[PDB]
C-alpha cells in the first residue's frame, strides 16, 4: 500500500519501479529524475552489498601482500596508497565505459538506458521475465538493507575498534 | 521638416550645433535659410532662435 | 509637481524600468511574498523550506556531535577531532579537511549539542531583580518606587 | 508658515549658506569630540 | 621600517616634540594661579597635547628624522588608514554629492521653468535626491550601462574644429 | 617637502599645458568665435559683443601661459 | 451565537463542534491570528508529549529500569536531564524523535494543505477505532486527557522545582 | 519577461537561454552596454584560468614536482620562489595559447561559439545532450573556481599558508 | 476639519484616517512636504527596529548567549564587548536584507515605483499570520502603536543607560537618583570652551 498512510502518495512514484511502497516523504522525484534516483539507489545498494561482504570477509581474510588493520575499516589505511589509486581509477574506468562516457544526469539516460541496467547477466540468471521481476525486487531490498547494514558495520567498527564478528562475540556496551 | 518638430542642428558654426531646437515656421519663398528654429539655451549674444536651411537640420 | 520622497521615478526624472511586477499573495515560510517564477511556490514554497529546515536540523545533530568516538578497553569512549584521521594517498596532505572544518565549534569554543548550545556554553539566564521586592525594601535595594516613597516622606 | 517666506528660504544663497554652515558645523563638532584625526584608526 | 622611517612610539625625536610642546604650555601655566580660568584652560590644552602624542605613538604611524608622522600612501595595507581608507570615505561622499546634484539637474530640466529650480531649489525634491546618494556606485553604474549616464558624441555641442 | 613641491610642479606643468593646449586646440575656432582662424594668431579681441571676447586669441593663451611658465620655473 | 465556555464572550468564529475537544474556548482570539489546523496539530503534539511526560513522571517514581540508578544520582525529573545528556540517552531520544518530527513537519504541511486531519498519523495497530462512535469518543478522550496531562506536567515539574520530591513522593510526604 | 535569478527585476535583454550558464543574472546591465558575446568569452576565459588556478593553489599541498619540491606550499611565497626564467617560459606558453584567442576574438569574433578555440581532442561534445551539459558545467565550474580562488587567495593573504593547511590547522581567522 | 490629536490645528492633508494610527498628528506639516508613503515606510521601519531594540535591551538584561564576550548585562557595554566580526556580520546582513526586501527599489525616487508596493509591506509574513483579513486593521494599528511606543521606550532606555551606567531593569531595581553633580547638559560655550 502506502508506507506513510497519513501522507498523500507521491505522484511520480506510480509503483512501476521495484520496491515502490510509496516511501517518498521529503519530496524527491518531484525535483529530480526518478531514473537518476533509482540508478543511484541500485549503485549505492550494489556497492554496499559488496561493502558489507568486504567488511565481514576482510576481518577474516588477509592477503599476504597487504597488512591487516586492527578493524576491517583500518585495512583501507594499511594497503598502499598507489594501490588505492589504482582501484579508484579502475572503478572510474568501469564507470566511464559502463555508462558510455555519459556520467551526468543530463546525458546518462539520453541514450534511453533503463535505470540500474548495465546488461550484466553472464550466467543468464535473469533471462526469465517473472524471475527477473522478483529478483529486481530482491536486489533493491537487499541493497537498501546493505546500505543500512554497511552504515552500522562501519560505524560500530569505528566505535568499538574490534570488528563485526568480534563485537558479536565479545560485546562491550558503551559506558 | 515641418512646423513644431524637434530638430538637430548641423551648422558647425552654430552655437546650438548638435543641440535640439524646435521649428517655429518654414518659409515657402526663395529664402536661403527658411527653417526658423527656437532653442531653450540662449547664445552668447543672448539670442535663443535662428534661421537655418533644410540641409542643416535633421528631424529627431 | 513632485510630492517629494514620493518614490515614483517619473516625478524625479529618474529612469524607470516600467515593467512593474504584479504582487502574488503567496508566501513561503522562510522567504518573502514577492513576484516569483511560474511553479516556484509549489516546488520551493512552505513545504520545501519547512521540510529542508527540518532535515537540516536532523542532520545537525550528528554534525554537532562530530568527532571520532573511540571506545577504550573500558566502556568509556574518547572524543577526538576528525583531523586525527590521517588519509593514506594524498602525499603531504596527511591530515584531511573534514566536517569539523565546515563546522568548527571546538576552535571557537562553542561545544555544540544536538539541541544547540550545550553543557559547555549554555544560555545564561540571570535574575535582574536580585531577590528583592518592588517596594518596601532595605538599604541593599532602592527601587524606583522606593525613590517615589522616599521623595513623598522627607 | 507663509509659502513666499519658504520660497525665499529655498533660494540658492540661503540654502547655500545654511547647508555649508550645517556642513561646517558638523565638521567642527566632529573635530571637537574626536580631534586630531590624521588617519583612519586601524 | 618602511622607507627608512621609524615608528613614532620609539623615535626619540617624536618624544622630544611632545616634551617641548608640553614645556611651552607649562611655562604659560607657570604664570597663573591654580583655580583661575586661564590656568584651567591651559591645563586642558596640555591634556589634549599629551592625548594627541599618546594616540599617534600607538597608531602605527611612522616618524621621520624630524619627529613628525609621515604617511605611506603606496597602497600597502599596513598603512591603508592614512590614505586608502580615508580616500574611500571621500570618494563615497564625493560620488554621493555628484550623483545627487546630477539627479537634481536632470529633474530640473523637466520643470515648467528649468532655471528657477536652480536658483530657488525645490527643497522636498532635492532632499529626496540627497537621500538617493547612499547607493550611488550601483545607481550610477546601472545608469552608465543602461545608456543614461553618457550621451552620444553627436548630441553634444562642439566647436567647428 | 619634496613630495609636496613635486605635486606643486605637477599642477604648474599641467596648468601651463592646459592654457597652451587650450590655445592650440581652440586656435582655429571655439563656440565664442567659430571663425577665429580667419582673424589670425594675434588679434586683440572680437569686441564687447557676445558677452565679451578679451584674450580670446591663441596668442592670448600664449600670453596667459607665460605667467604660468614663470610661476612653474619659479 | 455566544461561547459555551465563556458566556459573555462571542463564538471564536474559527472553531466548530466537528473538532475534537471543542468547548468554544478561544477568548484571546489566537485562532484568528494563526491557522486553526496548525493550532490543532500543535495542541495534539503538546498533548501527546505531555501525556507521555506525565506517565513518565509517575512511572519513574514507581520503578526504574535495570542499571539506571548508577548513571543518574538521586536526581529525578528535570534533574536527570543534565546527567543523561552526558551519556547518550537524551542524545539518542533527541535523534529519533527529531527523525520522526522531520516527517512530522511534512505531515503538518499536508495538514495545512487539507489532505489530512491534524494528528491523524493513521496509527491503529490494535483495533480500537473500528466503530465510528468509538473513534469520535476516543478522539475526545485523547484531547481532554492530553490538556489535563499538560497542566499536570507543569504541576509535576514545578513541584520538583519547589520540593525536589517527584509526584508519588510528594503524595506520600506532604 | 522577468529575470530567473532576480524574479522582481525585468529580464536583461541581451542575455538569452541559448548561452550555457544563463541564469538571467545581470542586475547591473553589463550586456546592454558591452557586447554579450565578448562578456561571454571573457567570463569563460576567466573561469578556465581560475579552474586551473584553483587546482593549482590546492595541488602543491599534495605533491610537488621534484625540481620545485623544496618550494613552499603557501602559493603566494611559491609565486616568488619560481625563477624569472620560469615565469618567462610560463608567460611565453600562455601567450602562445592566447595567439589563438587573439584570432578568435579580434578577427574571427562572430564565427563560432564563445570560448571555442578548437580544443576538443578526445572528441567530446559529439553527443548533443552531452555537449549541452558540458557547456553549462564548464561555465558553472568556472564561476565556482573564480569564487573559490578569490577566497583561497585572500585566505592565503591573511594566514600565510595554503587553504588546506589553514583548514587542518583551523587557522580560519585573522590573528 | 481640525485635527483630533492637536485640536487647535487644522487637520493635515495626506492624513485622511485611512492609515493605522492616523489620529491627525502632523503639527510641523512634514506630510505636506514629504509623501506619506515614505513617511509611513520610515515610521514602520524605525518602530520595528525599536521594538526589537527595546526587547533587545530587556532580554539582554535577562538572558545572554554564553561566553565572556556576551556577558554584558548593561546593553551599551554589549556594543563594545560583542565580537566585531559578528557585529559587522549583523551590519552586512542588515544591508543585504535592505536590498533584497526592498527589491532594489531602495531610494526615495524608486521605492513605491511599483503601484502594488504598500508602505511597510515588504512581503514579510512567514507564518501567514495576516492571512485573516479581519485582523488586518487591528494588527496594522497595533503594529504602528507598538512601534511608536518602542521608539519612545528605547530612546528612554538608552539615555537612562547614559545617565545611570546601569541596565534598564536593574536600574529600576537598584534605582539611584540623579545627583546633578555630573551629567550637566550643555555648557560648551558658557565657559567659552574647555
Ligand atoms: C542480493 C542479491 C542480488 C539479486 C537477487 C540480484 C538480482 C538481479 N540483478 Mg543484481 N547485483 C547484485 C545483487 C543482486 N542482484 C550486486 C551485489 C551487484 C554488484 C556486483 C549486482 C549487479 C547487477 C548488475 C550490474 C545487473 C544486475 C542484474 C540483475 C538481474 C538479473 C541477474 C540475476 O538474476 O541475478 C541473480 C543474482 C543472484 C542470485 C545473486 C548471486 C536481477 C534483477 C542485471 C539487470 O537486469 O539489471 C537490473 C544487471 O545488469 N545486478
Ligand atoms: C605609481 C605607482 C604605483 C601604483 C599605481 C600602486 C598601486 C597599488 N599598490 Mg603599490 N607600491 C608602489 C607603487 C605603486 N603602487 C611602490 C613604489 C611601492 C614600494 C615598494 C609599493 C608598495 C605596495 C605594497 C607593499 C602594496 C601595494 C599595493 C597597491 C594597491 C593598493 C590597493 C589595491 O588596489 O589593491 C587591490 C585591492 C582591490 C582591487 C580591492 C580591495 C578592496 C594598488 C594597486 C597593495 C596591493 O594590493 O598589492 C597588489 C600592497 O600590498 N603597493
Ligand atoms: C499550549 C498548548 C495548547 C495549544 C496549542 C492549544 C491549542 C488549542 N486549544 Mg487548547 N488547552 C490547553 C493547551 C493548548 N491548547 C490547555 C492546557 C487547556 C486547559 C485544559 C486547554 C483547553 C482548551 C479548551 C477547553 C478548548 C481549547 C481549544 C483550543 C484551540 C483553539 C485556539 C486556542 O485555544 O488558542 C491557542 C492556545 C494556545 C496557543 C496556548 C496559549 C498560549 C499563550 C498565549 C501563552 C503563550 C487550539 C487548537 C478550543 C478548541 O476548539 O479546541 C479544538 C477549546 O474549546 N483548549
Ligand atoms: C538508559 C537507560 C538504561 C541504563 C543506563 C541501563 C544500564 C544498565 N543496565 Mg539496563 N535496561 C534498560 C535501560 C537502561 N539500562 C532497559 C530499558 C531494559 C529493558 C527492560 C534494561 C534491561 C537490563 C537487564 C535485563 C540488565 C540490565 C543491566 C544493566 C547494567 C549493565 C551492567 C547497566 C548499568 C544488567 C544489570 O546489571 O542489571 C542489574 C542486566 O542484567 N539492563
Ligand atoms: C557566511 C556565513 C557565516 C559564517 C561562516 C560565520 C562565521 C562566524 N560568525 Mg557570523 N554571522 C553571519 C554569517 C556567518 N558567520 C550572519 C549572516 C550573521 C548575522 C545574523 C552573523 C552574526 C554573527 C554574530 C553576532 C557573531 C558571529 C560569530 C561568528 C564566528 C563564530 C561562530 C561560532 O562559534 O559558531 C558556533 C556558534 C553557533 C552556531 C551559535 C549560534 C547561536 C544562535 C543560533 C544565535 C541565535 C540566532 C538569532 C535568533 C538570530 C536571528 C536573526 C537572523 C535569522 C537574521 C564565526 C567566525 C561570532 C563571533 O565573531 O565570535 C567570535 C559572533 O559574535 N556571527
Ligand atoms: C553587495 C552585495 C553583493 C553583490 C550583489 C549585487 C547586487 C546588484 C544590484 C544592482 C542593481 O540592481 O542596481 C539597480 C538599482 C537602481 O538603479 C537604477 O535602476 C533603474 C531601473 O529602472 C534604472 O535602470 C536607473 O538607470 C538606475 O540608476 O540600484 C540599486 O538598487 C542599488 C542596490 C544594490 C545594493 C546596494 C547595497 C546593498 C547591499 C549592501 C550589503 C553590505 C552593507 C554594508 C557595507 C556597504 C558597502 C557594500
Ligand atoms: C522628535 C525628536 C525630539 C528630540 C527632543 C530633544 C530632546 C533633547 C533636547 C535638549 C534637552 C534639554 C537641553 C538643555 C541643554 C542646554 O540647553 O544646554 C545649553 C547649551 C549651551 O550652553 P550654555 O550657553 O548654556 O552654557 C551655560 C552654563 O551654565 C554652563 O557653561 O545649549 C546648547 O546649545 C546645547 C544643545 C546643542 C544645540 C545644537 C544641537 C544639534 C543641532 C542639530 C540640528 C537641530 C536639532 C534641534 C536643535 C534644538
Ligand atoms: C537539494 C538542493 C537544496 C537544498 C539542500 C535546500 C535546503 C534549503 C534549506 C535548508 C536548510 C532551507 C531553509 C531552504 C529554503 C528555501 N529554498 Mg531550498 N534547498 C535546495 C534547493 C532549492 C532550489 C533549487 C530553490 C530553493 C528555494 C528556497 C526558498 C525560497 C522560496 C522563496 O522565497 O519564494 C527557501 C526559503 C527557491 C529559491 O527561491 O531560492 C532563493 C528555489 O528555486 N531551494 N532550502
Ligand atoms: C576540454 C577537453 C578535455 C579537458 C580538460 C581539462 C584539463 C579540464 C580541467 C578542468 C579543471 C582543472 C577543473 C577545475 C575546477 C576547479 C574548481 C571548480 C575549484 C573550485 C574551488 C572552490 C570552490 C573552493 C574552495 C575553498 C575555499 C574558498 C575555502 C578553503 O578553506 C577551502 C576550499 C578548498 C573549500 C579533454 C582533455 C578531456 C579532451 C576533450 O576532448 C576536450
Ligand atoms: C533590516 C531592517 C530591520 C532591522 C534590524 C536589526 C537592527 C536587526 C539586528 C539583528 C541581530 C542583532 C541579529 C543577531 C544575530 C546574532 C547571532 C547570529 C549570534 C551568533 C552567535 C554565535 C555564532 C556564537 C558563539 C560562541 C563563541 C564564538 C565563543 C563563546 O565563548 C561564546 C559563544 C558560545 C556564544 C527591521 C527588521 C527591524 C525592519 C526592516 O525589515 C529593515
Ligand atoms: C510579523 C510576523 C511575525 C513576527 C514577529 C516579531 C519579531 C514580533 C515582535 C514584536 C515585538 C518585539 C514587539 C515589542 C514591543 C516593545 C515595546 C512596545 C516596548 C516599549 C517600551 C516602553 C514603552 C518603555 C519603557 C521603560 C523606561 C524608558 C524606563 C526603564 O527603566 C524601564 C521601562 C522598560 C519600563 C512572525 C515572525 C511570527 C511571522 C508572521 O507570519 C509575521
Ligand atoms: C563559509 C564562509 C562563506 C563566506 C566566507 C567569506 C567571508 C567573507 C570575509 C570573512 C571575513 C572574516 O572576518 C574576520 O574573521 C573573524 C570573524 O569573527 C574575526 O576573527 C576574530 O574572531 C575569531 C573567532 O574566535 C578569533 O579566532 C580571531 O582571533 C579574532 O580576530 C576577524 O576579526 C574578522 O576580521
HEC assignment per residue over chain I: CECCCCCCCECCCCCCCCCCCCCCCCCCCCCCCCCHHHHHHHHHHHHHHHHHHHHHHHHHHHEECCCHHHCCCCHHHHHHHCCHHHHHHHHHHHHHHHHHHCCCCCCCCCCCCCCCCCCCCCCCCCCCCCCCCCCHHHHHHHHHHHHHHHHHHHHHHHHHHHHCCCCHHHHHHCCCCCCCCCCCCCCCCCCCCC
- CA dist G94 to C62, G66, G75, I35, I91, Å? 11, 22, 20, 54, 35
**For residues G81 and G91, is the Cβ–Cβ distance under 8 A?**
no
CB B37 within 8 A of CB B9: yes
Q: Are strands C68-71 and E62-63 parallel, antiparallel or unpaired?
A: unpaired
CA distance E89 to D40: 10
CA atoms of H123 and H126, how far apart (whole Å): 7
| Ligand 11 midpoint to CA I155 (Å) | 13
Q: Is E146 on the interface with H (CB under 8 A)?
A: yes
Contact between C7 and I108 under an 8 Å Cβ cutoff? The reply is yes
The gap from C-alpha G37 to its chain's centroid, in whole angstroms, comes to: 16
A1 Cβ contact partners less than 8 Å away, ≥ 6 residues apart: A21, A22
Q: How far is CA G112 from the centre of its chain?
A: 20
Q: Tell me the structure's resolution in angstroms, rounded to a single decimal.
A: 3.0
User: CA A115, CA A92: separation in Å to the nearest integer?
Assistant: 19
Q: Measured in whole angstroms, how far is the alpha carbon of residue I152 from the centre of its chain?
A: 8
DSSP A101-158: T--SHHHHGGG-PPTT-----TT-TT-SHHHHHHHHHHHHHHHHHHHHHHHHHHHHHH
Cross-chain residue pair C119–G91, CB shorter than 8 Å: no
Q: How many CA atoms lie within 13 A of H58 on its CB side?
A: 15
> In 3D, which of E122, E90, E124 has the Cα closest to residue E108?
E122
Residues of B in contact with F51 (CB under 8 A): 44
**CA distances from residue F32 to E160, F35, F43, F44 in whole angstroms, order as listed:** 11, 9, 15, 14
Dihedral (C-alpha) I102, I104, I109, I114: value to the nearest 10 degrees?
-70
Nearest CA in chain E to D32: E48
Which has the closest alpha carbon to H85: H97, H96, H93, H74?
A: H93
Report the neighbours of I using a cutoff of 3 or more CB pairs below 8 angstroms: C, E, G, H
Do β-strands B6-9 and I63-64 pair in parallel, antiparallel, or remain unpaired?
unpaired
For residues H97 and H86, the answer to whether their CB atoms sit within 8 Å is: no
What is the C-alpha to C-alpha distance for residues F20 and F60, in angstroms, rounded to an integer? 10
Report yes or no: E7 and E63 within 8 Å, Cβ to Cβ.
yes
Which grid cell sits at I102? 526592498
- CB proximity G103 to A under 8 Å: yes
Residue I140 Cα to ligand 11 middle (Å):
14
Ligand 8 within 6 A of C46 CB?
no
G89 in contact with ligand 4, CB cutoff 6 A: yes
The method of structure determination was: cryo-EM
CB contact under 8 A, D40 and E85: yes
E and D in touch (3+ CB pairs within 8 angstroms):
yes
Phi/psi for B20 (5° steps) reads: -105, 125
Contacts of G57 (CB under 8 A, 6+ apart): G77, G153, G156, G157, G166, G167
I68 lines ligand 12 (CB under 6 A): no
Tell me if G12 sits within 8 A of I134, measured CB to CB: no
Separation of CA B29 from chain center: 17
Distance CA H56, CA H66 (A): 16
Supply the residue whose CA is at minimum distance from atom 19 of ligand 9.
H145
Q: Cell 466548530 sits at which residue? A: G16
User: Which residues, in sequence order, are bridge partners of residue B21?
Assistant: B7
Helix axes C46-64, G89-113, angle to 10 degrees: 180
Q: How close is the nearest chain C Cα to the Cα of G30, in Å?
A: 19
Q: How far is the CA of I138 from the centre of ligand 6 (A)?
A: 35
Q: A98: number of CA atoms within 13 Å, CB side?
A: 15
Nearest residue of F to residue B46, measured between CA atoms:
F50
Which ligand is the nearest neighbour of the Cα of E77? 2
Helix, strand, coil percent values for chain B (each to nearest 5): 5, 40, 55
A175, C75 Cβ separation under 8 angstroms: yes
Q: For residues I136 and I20, give the distance between their C-alpha atoms in angstroms, rounded to a whole number.
A: 10
- Please, which residues have CB within 8 angstroms of residue E73's CB and are 6 or more apart in sequence? E79, E82, E83, E84
- Using a 10 angstrom Cβ sphere, with 0-12 exposed, 13-18 middle and 19 or more buried, the burial of residue H113 is middle
- Strands in chain B per DSSP E: 6-9, 20-26, 35-38, 49-52, 57-59
Cell output for H133? 551539459
CA separation, residue I43 to residues H83, I51, I106, I141, I154 (Å): 64, 12, 15, 13, 15
d(CA B15, CA B44) in angstroms, rounded, equals 8
Contacts of E141 in chain H (CB under 8 A): 28
Nearest to residue A150, comparing CAs of A62, A68, A73? Answer: A73
Residues making up chain E, counted from first to last: 161
Q: How far apart are CA C142 and CA I172, in angstroms?
A: 9
Region label for A141, one of left (φ > 0), alpha (ψ between -120 and 50) or beta (otherwise): alpha
Compute CA distances I167 → I68, I78, I184, whole Å: 17, 11, 21
Nearest to I103 by CA among D7, C32, H158: C32
Half-sphere exposure of F2 (CA within 13 A, CB side): 1
Q: Which three cell numbers stand for residue E132?
A: 538617493
HEC sequence for I112-130: CCCCCCCCCCCCCCCCCCC
Closest to G156 in 3D by CA, of G168, G148, G166 = G166
Cα H104 to Cα A85: distance, rounded to the nearest angstrom: 39
Provide, as residue numbers in chain G, all residues whose Cβ is less than 8 Å from the Cβ of A5: 121-122
Residues of E in Cβ contact (< 8 Å) with B40: 114
Q: By CB neighbour count within 10 A (0-12 exposed, 13-18 middle, 19+ buried), where does G167 fall?
A: buried
Whole-angstrom distance, CA of residue G146 vs CA of residue G118? 15
Q: Is E77 annotated as a binding residue?
A: yes
The rounded distance, in Å, linking the Cα atoms of E63 and E69 is 4
Of I83, I68, I153, the C-alpha closest to I161 is I153
Enter the C-alpha cell of residue B59: 528631424
I104-113: string of b/e by CB count within 10 Å (b at 16+)? bbbbbbbbbb
HSE, CB side, 13 Å, CA atoms: give it for residue H52. 6
User: Cα(E139) to centroid of ligand 6, in Å?
Assistant: 6
Name residue, grid cell 540654502: D15
Does the beta carbon of I99 sit less than 6 angstroms from any atom of ligand 6? yes
**Nearest residue to C60 via CA among G83, A24, G91, A28:** G91
Report how far ligand 12's centroid is from the alpha carbon of I84 (Å): 9
A110:H137 CB<8 A: no
Q: B22 - beta bridge partners?
A: B6, B38
Q: First-to-last CA distance in chain E?
A: 55
Q: Under a CB-based contact definition with an 8 Å cutoff, are residues G71 and G87 in contact?
A: yes
Task: Give CA–CA dist A50/G48, Å, rounded.
Answer: 43
Cα–Cα distance for residue pair A34/C120, rounded to 1 Å: 45
Give me Rg for the CA atoms of chain D: 16
Task: Give the integer Cα–Cα distance in Å for G157 and G53.
Answer: 10
Question: Which 3-state string (H, E, C) describes chain H?
Answer: CECCCCCCCECCCCCCCCCCCCCCCCCCCCCCCCCHHHHHHHHHHHHHHHHHHHHHHHHHHCCCCCCCCCCCCCHHHHHHHCCHHHHHHHHHHHHHHHHHHHHHHHCCCCCCCCCCCCCCCCCCCCCHHHHHHHHHHHHHHHHHHHHHHHHHHHHHHHCCCCHHHHHHCCCCCCC
Chain centroid offset of residue E121 CA = 27
Angle ∠(I13,I19,I25) on CA atoms, nearest 5: 50
Interface chains of chain A (3 or more CB pairs under 8 Å): C, G, H
Q: Which residues pair with B20 in a beta bridge?
A: B8
Amino acid at each position: 500500500d502506502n508506507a506513510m498512510p497519513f501522507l498523500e502518495r507521491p505522484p511520480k512514484l506510480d509503483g512501476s519501479l521495484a520496491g515502490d511502497v510509496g516511501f517518498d516523504p521529503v519530496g524527491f522525484s518531484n525535483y529530480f529524475d526518478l531514473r537518476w534516483l533509482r540508478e543511484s539507489e541500485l549503485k549505492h545498494g550494489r556497492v554496499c552489498m559488496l561493502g558489507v561482504t568486504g567488511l565481514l570477509v576482510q576481518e577474516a581474510v588477509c592477503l599476504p601482500q597487504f597488512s591487516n588493520g586492527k578493524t576491517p575499516v583500518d585495512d583501507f589505511f594499511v594497503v598502499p596508497a598507489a594501490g588505492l589509486w589504482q582501484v579508484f581509477f579502475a572503478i572510474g574506468a568501469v564507470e566511464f565505459f559502463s555508462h558510455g562516457f555519459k556520467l551526468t544526469p543530463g546525458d546518462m539516460f539520453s541514450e534511453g538506458r533503463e535505470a540500474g541496467d548495465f546488461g550484466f547477466d553472464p550466467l543468464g540468471c535473469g533471462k526469465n521475465p517473472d524471475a527477473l521481476a522478483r529478483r529486481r525486487l530482491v536486489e533493491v531490498k537487499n541493497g537498501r538493507l546493505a546500505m543500512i547494514a554497511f552504515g552500522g558495520l562501519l560505524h560500530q567498527q569505528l566505535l568499538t575498534g574490534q570488528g563485526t564478528f568480534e563485537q558479536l562475540a565479545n560485546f562491550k556496551a558503551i559506558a | 521638416v515641418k512646423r513644431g518638430s524637434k530638430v538637430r542642428i548641423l551648422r558647425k558654426e552654430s552655437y546650438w550645433y548638435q543641440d535640439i531646437g524646435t521649428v517655429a515656421t518654414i518659409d515657402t519663398s526663395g529664402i536661403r535659410y527658411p527653417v526658423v528654429v527656437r532653442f531653450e539655451k540662449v547664445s552668447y549674444s543672448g539670442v535663443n532662435t535662428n534661421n537655418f536651411s533644410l540641409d542643416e537640420v535633421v528631424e529627431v | 509637481d513632485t510630492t517629494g520622497f514620493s518614490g515614483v521615478p517619473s516625478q524625479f526624472a529618474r529612469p524607470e524600468s516600467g515593467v512593474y511586477p504584479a504582487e502574488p499573495t503567496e508566501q513561503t515560510f522562510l522567504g518573502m511574498r514577492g513576484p516569483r517564477a511560474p511553479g516556484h511556490r509549489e516546488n520551493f514554497g512552505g513545504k520545501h523550506t519547512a521540510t529542508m529546515l527540518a532535515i537540516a536540523a536532523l542532520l545537525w545533530q550528528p554534525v554537532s556531535e562530530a568527532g571520532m568516538y573511540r571506545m577504550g578497553a573500558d566502556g568509556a569512549l574518547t572524543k577526538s577531532s576528525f583531523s586525527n584521521m590521517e588519509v593514506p594517498g594524498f602525499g603531504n596532505m596527511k591530515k584531511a579537511p573534514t566536517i569539523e572544518s565546515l563546522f568548527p565549534f571546538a576552535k571557537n569554543g562553542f561545544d555544540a549539542s544536538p539541541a544547540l548550545f550545550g553543557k559547555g556554553s549554555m544560555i545564561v539566564v540571570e535574575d535582574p531583580r536580585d531577590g528583592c521586592g518592588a517596594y518596601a525594601n532595605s538599604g541593599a535595594c532602592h527601587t524606583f518606587l522606593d525613590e517615589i516613597g522616599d521623595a513623598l516622606k522627607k | 508658515m507663509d509659502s513666499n517666506f519658504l520660497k525665499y528660504l529655498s533660494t540658492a544663497p540661503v540654502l547655500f549658506t545654511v547647508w555649508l554652515s550645517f556642513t561646517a558645523s558638523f565638521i567642527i563638532e566632529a573635530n571637537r569630540f574626536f580631534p586630531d584625526m590624521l588617519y583612519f584608526p586601524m | 621600517d618602511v622607507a627608512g622611517l621609524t615608528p613614532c612610539g620609539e623615535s626619540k625625536e617624536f618624544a622630544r616634540r611632545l616634551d617641548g610642546s608640553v614645556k611651552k604650555l607649562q611655562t604659560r601655566l607657570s604664570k597663573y594661579e591654580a583655580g583661575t580660568p586661564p590656568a584651567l584652560a591651559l591645563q586642558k590644552q596640555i591634556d589634549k597635547t599629551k592625548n594627541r602624542f599618546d594616540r599617534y605613538g600607538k597608531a602605527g604611524l611612522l616618524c621621520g628624522t624630524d619627529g613628525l608622522p609621515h604617511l605611506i600612501t603606496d597602497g600597502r595595507w599596513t598603512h591603508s588608514g592614512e590614505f586608502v581608507i580615508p580616500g574611500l570615505l571621500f570618494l563615497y561622499v564625493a560620488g554621493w554629492i555628484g550623483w545627487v546634484g546630477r539627479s537634481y539637474v536632470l529633474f530640473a530640466r523637466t520643470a515648467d521653468k528649468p532655471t528657477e529650480k536652480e536658483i530657488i531649489i525645490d527643497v522636498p525634491v532635492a532632499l529626496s535626491f540627497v537621500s538617493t546618494g547612499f547607493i550611488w556606485p550601483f545607481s550610477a553604474f546601472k545608469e552608465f550601462t543602461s545608456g543614461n549616464l553618457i550621451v552620444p558624441a553627436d548630441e553634444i555641442t562642439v566647436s567647428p574644429r | 617637502g619634496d613630495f609636496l613641491i613635486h605635486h606643486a610642479i605637477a599642477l604648474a606643468l599641467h596648468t601651463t599645458t592646459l592654457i597652451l593646449v587650450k590655445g592650440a586646440l581652440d586656435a582655429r575656432g571655439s563656440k565664442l568665435m567659430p571663425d577665429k582662424k580667419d582673424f589670425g594668431y594675434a588679434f586683440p579681441c572680437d569686441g564687447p559683443g557676445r558677452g565679451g571676447t578679451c584674450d580670446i586669441s591663441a596668442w592670448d593663451a600664449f600670453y596667459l601661459s607665460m605667467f604660468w611658465m614663470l610661476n612653474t620655473i619659479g | 451565537a455566544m461561547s459555551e465556555s465563556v458566556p459573555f464572550l462571542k463564538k471564536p468564529e474559527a472553531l466548530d463542534s466537528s473538532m475534537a475537544g471543542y468547548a468554544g474556548f478561544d477568548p484571546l482570539g489566537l485562532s484568528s491570528i494563526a491557522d486553526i489546523k496548525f493550532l490543532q496539530e500543535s495542541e495534539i503534539k503538546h498533548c501527546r508529549i505531555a501525556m507521555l511526560a506525565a506517565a513518565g513522571s509517575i512511572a519513574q517514581d514507581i520503578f526504574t529500569f535495570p542499571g539506571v540508578s548508577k548513571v543518574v544520582g538521586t536526581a529525578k525529573m528535570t534533574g536527570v536531564h543534565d546527567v543523561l545528556v552526558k551519556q547518550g540517552a537524551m542524545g539518542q531520544i533527541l535523534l529519533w524523535t527529531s527523525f520522526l518530527e522531520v516527517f512530522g513537519t511534512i505531515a503538518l504541511l499536508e495538514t495545512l494543505d487539507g489532505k489530512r486531519a491534524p494528528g491523524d498519523f493513521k496509527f491503529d495497530p490494535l483495533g480500537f477505532s473500528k466503530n465510528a462512535e468509538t473513534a469520535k469518543r476516543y478522539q475526545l478522550s485523547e484531547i481532554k486527557n492530553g490538556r489535563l496531562a499538560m497542566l499536570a506536567t507543569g504541576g509535576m515539574v514545578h513541584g520538583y522545582f519547589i520540593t525536589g520530591k517527584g509526584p508519588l513522593e510528594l503524595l506520600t510526604n506532604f | 519577461e522577468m529575470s530567473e535569478a532576480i524574479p522582481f527585476m525585468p529580464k536583461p535583454a541581451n542575455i538569452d537561454s541559448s548561452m550555457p550558464g544563463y541564469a538571467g543574472f545581470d542586475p547591473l546591465g553589463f550586456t546592454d552596454y558591452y557586447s554579450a558575446k565578448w562578456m561571454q568569452e571573457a567570463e569563460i576565459k576567466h573561469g578556465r584560468v581560475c579552474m586551473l588556478a584553483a587546482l593549482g593553489m590546492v595541488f602543491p599541498e599534495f605533491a610537488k614536482f621534484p625540481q620545485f619540491a623544496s618550494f613552499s606550499t603557501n602559493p603566494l611565497e611559491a609565486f616568488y620562489q619560481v625563477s624569472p626564467a620560469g615565469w618567462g617560459q610560463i608567460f611565453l606558453f600562455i601567450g602562445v595559447l592566447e595567439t589563438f584567442s587573439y584570432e578568435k576574438s579580434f578577427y574571427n569574433f562572430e564565427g563560432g561559439a564563445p570560448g571555442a578555440l578548437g580544443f576538443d581532442p578526445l572528441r567530446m561534445s559529439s553527443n548533443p545532450a552531452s555537449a549541452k551539459q558540458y557547456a553549462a558545467a564548464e561555465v558553472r565550474n568556472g564561476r565556482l573556481a573564480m569564487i573559490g580562488f578569490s577566497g583561497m587567495l585572500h585566505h592565503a593573504i591573511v594566514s600565510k599558508q595554503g587553504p588546506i593547511t589553514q583548514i587542518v590547522e583551523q587557522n580560519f581567522y585573522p590573528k | 476639519a481640525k485635527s483630533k490629536a492637536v485640536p487647535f490645528l487644522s487637520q493635515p492633508e495626506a492624513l485622511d484616517g485611512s492609515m493605522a494610527g492616523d489620529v491627525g498628528f502632523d503639527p510641523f506639516g512634514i506630510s505636506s512636504v514629504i509623501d506619506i508613503k515614505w513617511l509611513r515606510e520610515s515610521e514602520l521601519k524605525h518602530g520595528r527596529i525599536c521594538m526589537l531594540a527595546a526587547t533587545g535591551c530587556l532580554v539582554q538584561e535577562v538572558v545572554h548567549l554564553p561566553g565572556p564576550a556576551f556577558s554584558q548585562k548593561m546593553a551599551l557595554n554589549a556594543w563594545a564587548a560583542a565580537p566585531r566580526g559578528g557585529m559587522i556580520s549583523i551590519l552586512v546582513a542588515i544591508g543585504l536584507i535592505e536590498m533584497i526586501s526592498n527589491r532594489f527599489a531602495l531610494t526615495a525616487t524608486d521605492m513605491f515605483a511599483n503601484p502594488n508596493r504598500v508602505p511597510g509591506d515588504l512581503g514579510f509574513d512567514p507564518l501567514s499570520l495576516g492571512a485573516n483579513p479581519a485582523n488586518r486593521a487591528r494588527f496594522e494599528l497595533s503594529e504602528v502603536i507598538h512601534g511608536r511606543a518602542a521608539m519612545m521606550g528605547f530612546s528612554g532606555m538608552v539615555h537612562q543607560m547614559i545617565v545611570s551606567k546601569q541596565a534598564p531593569i536593574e536600574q529600576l531595581m537598584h534605582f539611584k537618583a540623579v545627583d546633578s553633580s555630573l551629567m550637566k547638559l550643555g555648557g560648551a560655550a558658557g565657559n567659552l570652551g574647555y
